[PDB]
């Protein structure tokens, strides 16, 4: 049985140690950028997430996710299905055949998008992008559609799931923990857990682990769900690599690491410097925003007369006797602010904060999506090039096969049933 | 350094050898009452398991830095001249000599201390982390 | 100086008016899409989040109640209860 | 509310203080109750007879709280709705809402895992808000001295 | 009837204690933006909500709600009813 | 960034009254008694920049 | 000990002013008393450990966020 | 681009208090006692540049 | 230059010749206590394998520039 020999929880707990460094970094990136987005496991319902002293990180994180989502999933069609290895007999001759299949492939793509938008995939995908920026990586799972139902895709935070990789980079095994109430459990799971023993109330929470492993015997991926150490019978199934609905997506890939790293972590050492500088500036102002009247004891003026006297009341005293305590750090304020401005401008181009054309967009436009896309390549590295290829294409593969069984497929010749997929910019035109 | 109370008596002795008794933190909470360490914030002079404080302890004339020995002599020279045979001519010179003696001793203090405002500093060290 | 600096951070976060929407005396589809894009630039994705949690369920319930009031000419329930899209695709003619 | 004909039918808004909700880490709703205090004369006729059926004279201006509890049935995934007045369920008010189509729509602007409630958008910038509060408060006060 | 075995009275009370931090956050958030939107339970009819010393939160809160309404709920259509009698056969046949 | 209040020991002003006093409180002292430590490297900062 | 020295050097200066006046002894003891007073102040600031940010009553509430 | 704090030995300020003290901590000393070493070649830099 | 303890006693001698002891890098730790080198930070006057410090040693009137 290979990897599943230990179980689903034993492997999950064993792999927590490797996940722990990534969780620590993800929390650190959150602390300086919208700390509510990645919360600590211990903290719940009374945390009162403290706002960062600097606001560049929270603003930058939203900007990157907003810019990515615009380029990653434009309003217009962003998937193109092409046919190859037999186009030689299809391109040279049969003009009518090309026209028929092109309309048919267009039929599949538009139907695919209607399933995305009607099922509220976009709202879940934007949440993943924000979690990709602050945390190392996110796992997106696409459950099978049953009948006519609204089934949102299920995103799993870095803490919830685990995945193992080798130096090659392919996925060996991945385990996911999910918390579901007993009353909310499906029919199959609730009857199995009741068979375990005892009586479970509706509010009672139990953990389910779905282990997806690569058996040594064959290259198929087998997945099973267990409740309190016992697998439910209906969970077992075999999926190929290309059609696995459990999609782990890493933004910044490193060789030999099962997990990706967050974009912000490279700037986290810099937001840390910016936060400290802005922390002192506000604290200096808090000292400044305090009134203390330093009365010179050798003076004539007595504060009892000043406080008791009404407005415009002649009081015996001398003006030089009364003085006020002031913060003297004028030179230190301007040097600290000067460095803070330099850091902010440095972070501005890193997070795509300043962009005049991008500021004003009245409607979605085909060229604008390309222009948004080009900027994500000129700066920010090649995340669009890599992350979308790890994101957009697997979503198209997994959704296509799932819908293909459900949807009706007309008579399509040879490779038309399974066309090659192009995503991102390269499918815009 | 840790001051240990007598387990039977439960109170620490604040002997005259202790020139200064200060808490390691910002606010010092230990004062002298009846020759025994007294916690003014706690209104109790009975301690258990000991306390950690900062103490200046008296030493002999020896067992002192050499740079400080001349300053001790130069200050004592001024008072000794002043008290018994007060001569204005020698008194003026010793005042200049004492000011130089203090200057060297501070120069020793910075050399001995080796204080760093970037990394030795308590607050600034946490800021430099990147 | 510090209070003014703090005001700038809050003004951007709350999208304080910088002639972005105050300009103009008419409401058009293009302006609505301009605001919709802006609401995704800041505020995370609350425009998307509220679309799933507020805009979508509100249509579904009224669709059932309005179904009793107005009999759809087509008997099948799919025509009676079509799939609902409440995103930016709804804004504008199409 | 239900259309109940062509009569004017406004949406009822429940502030967080009025109602309560319980959710699982899955994000779905387990049980939820709304508290409504309505004067005895203004009570709906079905509620009025239930209060009268319960017993005890009630003044018209006196307000009686009403609780509407919807919970998942453990046997079948269907919402069950009932109202109780003074701890007594209203007769005939019990009804089975269609699955995942109950008229109550609990809304959270910010969704956090393992948390039944949601958080405001202001709390992200509440700190910068209160720091501005302290600074402007001292600026005004210094102007008062001058 | 396990969830409702205690009754709506009791289940309201225990679950209300869960929302106690949340109503505290809303009151604190309201205290700085607009004290009127979220008032405490005790104060009523004699509250005299003191104005915030800064109007940015008040100015922003009203602006934020308005901007959402224009995009979410304009006079134009804001739900799209897409008909799919079949996943793919509807347009074909 | 770090704030250090350099109190002249020969001065009248004592930090205990400064801290305990509320806002808008008359405190016995002199303004020149209290000073703050500042990094004076301005020529170095401008040439390095 | 800082204050015990100050009391003695203050009483020593007071002793010769009143009863038996020695001009040169007064000149030095005046300087010494100022130095002794300065040291007792530094003791008090070191003992107090007063903090304008968190230690004080007013600003401490402001910084809490 | 090098920080050196030149403490005047005739001064009252002692670096041990400054380094151990936290932010916003009242410290006995005088500001003139603390100074920083600076490069004085301002005229030479502008001619060389 | 290294100072080596006595093998049995494990103590180094702070002789009157030694005009100053300072640590090589900074924050000098070794101080004189009872005529023996004492490490104030580690609170131990017993050393092994020796210590490395900067020593100023007395010289005659000659042997000086």
Residue numbers in the entry:
A (entry chain A): 6 to 434
B (entry chain M): 67 to 196
C (entry chain B): 343 to 436
D (entry chain B): 148 to 293
E (entry chain B): 6 to 98
F (entry chain L), H (entry chain K): 294 to 342
G (entry chain N): 132 to 196
I (entry chain X): 67 to 131
Give the text the authors published on this PDB structure.
The bacteriophage T7, Escherichia coli podophage, has been employed as a model for the investigation of the DNA packaging and delivery mechanism among tailed phages and related dsDNA viruses. The tail, connected to a unique vertex of the head by the dodecameric portal gp8, consists of the dodecameric adaptor protein gp11 and the hexameric nozzle protein gp12 (20, 24) surrounded by six trimeric tail fibers gp17 (16, 22, 24). The core is formed by the core proteins gp14, gp15, and gp16; upon virion adsorption onto host membranes or the receptor rough lipopolysaccharide (LPS), these core proteins have been suggested to extend the tail channel and form a trans-envelope channel for genome delivery into the infected cell.
We also reconstructed an asymmetric structure of the DNA-ejected T7 complexed with LPS at a resolution of 8.2 Å and the local structure of the portal–tail complex at a resolution of 3.5 Å. Compared with the tail structure of the mature T7, the hexameric tail nozzle of the DNA-ejected T7 undergoes conformational changes, leading to the opening of the tail channel. Hairpin A of one gp12 molecule is close to hairpin B of the adjacent gp12 molecule. Six copies of gp14 (residues 25–143) and twelve copies of gp6.7 (residues) were resolved in the extended channel in the DNA-ejected T7. Moreover, each short α-helix of gp6.7 binds to the turn of the two antiparallel α-helices of gp14, forming a three-helix bundle, and each long loop of gp6.7 connects the cleft between two adjacent gp14 molecules. Six copies of conformer B of gp6.7 are located outside the channel, staying in the opposite direction along the channel compared with the conformer A. Moreover, each short helix α1 binds to the distal end of the two antiparallel α-helices, forming a three-helix bundle, and helix α2 binds to the interface of two adjacent nozzle proteins of gp12 and the turn of the antiparallel α-helices of gp14. The gp14–gp6.7 complex embedded in the open nozzle extends the tail channel, with the distal end of this channel connecting to LPS.
